[PDB]
């Protein structure tokens, strides 16, 4: 077939509709559901699937004890059918490791998994389900990547990596792959001061990634990538509507070219859609912890350091646990525009619910509507007491 080209703009976002939900923890109470975390969603030209890092055990399995741990030899990127839960019997292993990204270029899928000890990790780049290229750690401190889908244009698929400290300056690189081969890489440039866990989407203007500053900032850094020239810039979302977690309260002036201060050495993966007057930002409702989730329409959030919300939608009540969130779109859908989508990881278990000894999650996902739809809220839905 042919490589996909980013030839459309975003659809107008007037509200968000339910797209997928797997109820994995509810079902896993009484089924062979794998413990996971760091989920995402990614489409092929003929199917969309859920993705996540398995922990190599089921929830009811005794090996679920200790799964708060992020990195082990028992983790792997798995995918499974949209809105099904990740079961032992329906999950397809994409590659082995504890940090990942994946995207389809229109012809085949590229998946990248990083594994190894903290001081000697390596990425293996798979294309069309075969290993093609490998990248060794350059800073010997937890080589790591997006934890959500990458995006491709005319065969070129950029991916953001970081290696180095999580609590100070680190070495971030943007890699440009084609058919799994390394075309080029560049060191991070621009005014973003620290980069983790980029959430990306593409449209005719280029590729936009909204990341996590784990060091000093509670505004989110943004990397904008031209996949044709294979170049990028970076800054922060200018808006005073702050979207990392934990975070300070919203001021009236944001920061475009430096971290907004108040919270250090922590954060959460998140996302945004930055599209002028059609801009929407995602964030946890709580400023203290990974609870709740909302979308806020914030015109020109990227560039306007005074911008505030003019519309919103609650996705998960503050009373309910959330977690990581990221962007994806069905680039192969019919129509004249790309419909913005996102997922929210709904983390259950440790550290917040420590009566159980495991940590897992379920997934909820939404896409945009041009209608102004009524809102519901979407909890994980499992009762912790049932697992005791």
């Amino acid at each position: 077939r042919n490589f996909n080209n980013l030839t459309k703009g975003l659809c107008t976002i007037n509200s968000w509709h339910i797209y997928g939900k797997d109820n994995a923890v509810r079902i896993g109470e009484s089924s062979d559901v794998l413990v996971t975390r760091e989920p995402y969603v990614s489409c092929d030209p003929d199917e969309c699937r859920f993705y996540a890092l398995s922990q190599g055990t089921t929830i009811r399995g005794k090996h679920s004890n200790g799964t708060i741990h992020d990195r082990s030899q028992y983790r792997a990127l798995i995918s499974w059918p949209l809105s099904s839960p990740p079961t032992v019997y329906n999950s397809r292993v994409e590659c082995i490791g504890w940090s990942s990204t994946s995207c389809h270029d229109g012809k085949s899928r590229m998946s990248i998994c990083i594994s190894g000890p903290n001081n000697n990790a390596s990425a293996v780049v798979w294309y069309n389900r075969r290993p093609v290229a490998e990248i060794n750690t350059w800073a010997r401190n937890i080589l790591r990547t997006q934890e959500s889908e990458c995006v491709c244009h005319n065969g070129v698929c950029p991916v953001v990596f970081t290696d180095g400290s999580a609590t100070g300056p680190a070495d971030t690189r943007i890699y440009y792959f084609k058919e799994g081969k390394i075309l080029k890489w560049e060191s991070l440039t621009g005014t973003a001061k620290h980069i983790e866990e980029c959430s990306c989407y593409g449209e005719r203007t280029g590729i936009t990634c909204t990341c996590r500053d784990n060091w000093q900032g509670s505004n989110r850094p943004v990397i904008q990538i031209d996949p044709v020239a294979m170049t990028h810039t970076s800054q922060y979302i200018c808006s005073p509507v702050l979207t990392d977690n934990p975070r300070p309260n919203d001021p009236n002036i944001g920061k475009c070219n430096d971290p907004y201060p108040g919270n250090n050495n922590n954060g959460v993966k998140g996302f945004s859609y930055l599209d002028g007057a059609n801009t929407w930002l995602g964030r946890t409702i709580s400023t203290a912890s990974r609870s709740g989730y909302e979308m806020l329409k914030v015109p020109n959030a990227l560039t306007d350091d005074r911008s505030k919300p003019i519309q919103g939608q609650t996705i998960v009540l503050n009373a309910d646990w959330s977690g990581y969130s990221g962007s994806f779109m069905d680039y192969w859908a019919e129509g004249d525009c790309y419909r913005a989508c996102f997922y929210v990881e709904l983390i259950r278990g440790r550290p917040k619910e420590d009566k159980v000894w495991w940590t897992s999650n379920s997934i909820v996902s939404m896409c945009s509507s041009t209608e102004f739809l009524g809102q519901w809220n979407w909890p994980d839905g499992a009762k912790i007491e049932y697992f005791l």
Copy 2:
């Protein structure tokens, strides 16, 4: 490929033969079978499948407690292979929500799921497994739809929706979709006074839907749709053979243009095949509760307010629990006529069997024969005591 056209009449119905049965509750006693309700059956050009609303838990799972509840964030329309049970590992999620319909147009399948709180629900229309259009509540009172398959002609697939009171006048609309797009909608016209849970089938004359009057009537309202002109009429089945549940005893004069009185604010989804002398009506055997099921040959039931049965077939004994029933046909079968089919939902658990804390069902399904076949009866088959 090509859109299916309704170019045939119904086959002559001389009896009913077994088509499918999943024994879901029997199997779910000792397997990872999802709790469901509101099942149906629908064919693609190359396969026929069972459908239902999952409750996002298995039967033996602790989350099965409380599944008498109709609407939650944990429900989804699932489909699975004909006569298999709906398991965690074989069920395909079509969309997320607590009211649904689905149909194949010959090229691709349209599925519609409604979700949300009672005062802010919305329908998402999926086509070829992608979300295409969305419809917001118009009466802010449980936007809801068929709970069985829709039917298509030359790409046009009509669907009946209701929004508003379940116990008085409500706002019913007929929507006409093509490739998931809204071509047109109309407010209900005709003499049907209240519409719920329409069961539809198509043939050369047009599309016929037999619905549930939940307000005052125990005769069933009928909507007849011309999918070419995109217009409809409505009335009730004229026959004094009453087919809702609960219901009064059969009189000798029915009602064509108004509810037959005696039972208010309740009902059950049901169906009929209205075809002159080849007319057959389905109903529960009991007039009081959802138990038993029978088919009755009632010539000209639609138009003759004196019509009585001249032949029948017991499907489920009165001693056994039934539930919802609806119509479907294999529009892609060989031959010169469409073979009428139906399913019966066999509800187990609450409220009728309250020693368990769950509510689920299994499915039995029949299609017509031109032979005069011997009859059996088809119970769910599970022993409640085994679940205690």
Copy 3:
């Protein structure tokens, strides 16, 4: 594609090699394996599969209690991948009922399932996974069929049915189907006096079925069918090597045209390959019960009432339980001849092992070799005590 034609002779049978074995009862001790009985094997042009009548419950499920019972509304013909066990999650339902046959004609598969009460049973004939024709009971006494595969030539697939007494004269019919349609049926002719559970195979000479005389005979009746003329003859295997069970000891003169006496009102489904000097007969080792299984090379067994064995092979030791056995071949294999195959049902549980309350089986299957291969024996392999 094209209808298969029977254009080859049987390969020379010099021994038997292992073909498939599912170990279903061993695995079902700790997995969701369906209770079955009456298994067989049948090939499509691109795959061979195991078949059986499910009981609509797993072995460890509480509903396994009482599965010695032959006929219920919870039974169905299922198929599953060769040598896998019949699980809830991998079994495909072919049709609903408690007596079956199935065969591929080269283009599509025909499957036939009979259901109903003893006095009102009916067959539904499925073709290309759709119901096509139905046949009502003609003797009102357990309409029943082969319990192993049928065979097709140029689209014509003959099937043997019986309706009536199991312990006296009954009404046997041979039906000729094409694309599921009834071309013709004939009443049984010839010297076979009672017919049950025919096991059939085809080759250039025509179709040969070896059946069970449940009335007075312990030699097996044979029906020979010409699928072109759509005619048949019948007699018994002439050989004094008797192959029904239970049965008298082997005499030195068999019976060609009447039952060999000594055992009444019982029997077991079995098979043979009748091919002049290349003739092999299957039988239980025990004359008293369904235990053991052996193949015996008995030249001209069909026609020679003095014929004895000149070679043999033990398949299952007398110490181990067997059961039904039947013939099938891969008509789509490469080469100049059809390789004879068979399966043996290995029954576990009731009535012979009554410490458990269920009855199920596993499958072992062999095909012929032109080599003279060493023999092993093939027990079910499960330990009953594990189920207590």
Copy 4:
């Protein structure tokens, strides 16, 4: 399609990257995972899969008791998706038996399974999922084969078999198959004195097999096969870096044409890649038992009796249990060279961990990189105490 030809050399091996890992024992603690042993990996042109000999029971099943036993009627060669575990519901049976090999020739797959008692075993050769040829025992003492993949060139697939004593001279044969048919076989020639469990790979020079001398040698015998002429030679790896287990300590002079002495009547399946300066050898870290695993770069190991390591990589720590290891490659990958791969069987349970009554394994697999990648170690990961 077309038969694959071996037209490329090996890629330069500068380190090894993670390829696959199934975590089968961890997952099997709480899922329906089959007990296995003797695993391997093999690619089709469109997919790579894990293979192993099932024991016909799950790990948690009561029939897992006694699975240290190598040969029973309940074993079968199964395959399943790369990095998934071998479950009851996802495992495909290739053939029945207790010793196997399998390989794809570019058009279809050949699989070979041996079954029978020790004195009467036989191989059945399957091609395109059908039995094609059979081979009877020639020495009446456990006919046996590779336990990892074979390799094909222009349709010709050589396979190494042994029949006879495991502790003295035996009868080894090299068979040459095409489309499952026997083209030719030869008795072993050359200086290898005993052959077991050959691990093979192919490249433009021909096919290279590294085997196990179970009799007197702790260096590994090598068979080099020309699949065009259908001839072979044999010797031992000349290097003093000894790679069998158990084994003596490494001397400074190896043995090219005779066993290196010190350990008798034992061994382990292993492998090597013999490619001049690009030579890498696999071995257990322990000289005493099947624990640990490492790769060592040993230039000209095949031919240089003084050769030592110049680079290495730990795969499994000595503290962790290993087991069998073997070679495979994706012959259908893109690029100008074949990327060397291997698997290591990670044995859990008996005899080394006798608090449980079963023996099973999981799989880890690596392929070569032209980068110099950081190393991790890859334990099975299950906690035995959880199974008590």
